[PDB]
Design a protein around this motif. Structure first.
Motif, PDB file in Angstrom:
ATOM      1  N   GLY A   1       0.791  -1.238   0.052  1.00 27.84           N
ATOM      2  CA  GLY A   1      -0.005  -0.037  -0.121  1.00 27.84           C
ATOM      3  C   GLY A   1       0.840   1.158   0.085  1.00 27.84           C
ATOM      4  N   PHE A   2       1.195   1.756  -1.187  1.00 30.45           N
ATOM      5  CA  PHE A   2       1.826   2.962  -1.500  1.00 30.45           C
ATOM      6  C   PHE A   2       0.653   4.093  -0.941  1.00 30.45           C
ATOM      7  CE2 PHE A   2       4.644   0.292  -3.846  1.00 30.45           C
ATOM      8  CZ  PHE A   2       5.765   0.997  -3.802  1.00 30.45           C
ATOM      9  N   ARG A   3       1.138   5.366  -0.609  1.00 31.20           N
ATOM     10  CA  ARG A   3       0.128   6.237  -0.263  1.00 31.20           C
ATOM     11  C   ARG A   3       0.657   7.489  -1.013  1.00 31.20           C
ATOM     12  NH1 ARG A   3      -2.444   2.528   0.702  1.00 31.20           N
ATOM     13  NH2 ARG A   3      -2.691   1.470   2.762  1.00 31.20           N
ATOM     14  N   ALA A   4      -0.602   8.360  -1.537  1.00 31.69           N
ATOM     15  CA  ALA A   4      -0.419   9.656  -2.172  1.00 31.69           C
ATOM     16  C   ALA A   4       0.337  10.634  -1.232  1.00 31.69           C
ATOM     17  CB  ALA A   4      -1.679  10.239  -2.612  1.00 31.69           C
ATOM     18  N   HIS A   5       1.512  11.383  -1.788  1.00 29.90           N
ATOM     19  CA  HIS A   5       1.934  12.497  -1.064  1.00 29.90           C
ATOM     20  C   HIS A   5       2.236  13.733  -2.015  1.00 29.90           C
ATOM     21  CE1 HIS A   5       2.368  11.052   3.295  1.00 29.90           C
ATOM     22  NE2 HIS A   5       2.323   9.896   2.609  1.00 29.90           N
TER      23      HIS A   5
END
Lengths: 142, 149
Positions: A130-134
């Motif tokens: 789970g990559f997350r938007a930044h």
């Protein structure tokens, strides 16, 4: 039917072809293809590929660049790019498999994070990983 | 050479005797715990062999590094082998801020990317840094994803 493995000199031709889906991929000679491959090694890049064993066709590719920073005590950051899957193998779990692998290679080098840039469509796929938007990718054309 | 304000500053490539003041500057970006000259040199050689160029503002008469930015010049099989530039770790000292040093760093690295045949330069910006990069020609495109560990 498929094998995940590091890119080799003899893939370079088919692999250049598969990338033709990312952007224009005009021909390079054996000489040019091997030098680019050398500079990519010198640069701390691993390209992992799916090869369909009978035909030898590269049907999947993703690259990791790992580089030391002076910050965080010298700890590495991994950067993933140019994830490309054959139009015939899309929907088949190859993209996920490649990313997973490169994140593991990142882990085994002690990176503290893996970064990539994502299109609007690849977002949910990455977040399951789970990559997350930044931050926001900015581009300048030269 | 494009003009920047400040008579006492020089824009130049990072050097081995800078490494310690430079790590100190980078503490304004994130945690920068201290490293021995041996570690510093090792990391600096590794980054250099990888094809990263670090440009630096140095306050000449103290030796102090007051601005840094890094460029990875990254080779590709597509587009006839034309490289992609990536900028990272742009930081100027709070005392030298608002004088256009970050602009001069970016502009300088964009010019270097052009010399090395790059067809584009990418970076990632925080929400606040957005207008800054806009003003330098960068346009918003993809979203940075991050995986921790």
């Amino acid at each position: 039917d498929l094998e995940l493995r590091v890119l080799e000199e003899s893939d370079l031709s088919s692999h250049l072809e598969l990338l033709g889906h990312l952007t224009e991929a005009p021909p390079l000679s054996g000489v040019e293809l091997a030098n680019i491959a050398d500079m990519r090694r010198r640069a701390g890049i691993v390209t992992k590929v799916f090869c369909h064993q009978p035909t030898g066709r590269i049907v999947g590719s993703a690259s990791l660049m790992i580089q030391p920073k002076f910050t965080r005590g010298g700890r590495a950051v991994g950067h993933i790019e140019d994830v490309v899957v054959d139009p015939s193998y899309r929907g088949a779990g190859l993209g996920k498999a490649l990313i997973m692998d490169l994140c593991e290679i990142s882990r085994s080098k002690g990176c503290y994070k893996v970064i990539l840039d994502s299109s609007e469509k690849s977002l949910p796929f990455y977040e399951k990983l789970g990559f997350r938007a930044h931050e926001r990718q900015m581009r300048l054309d030269l």
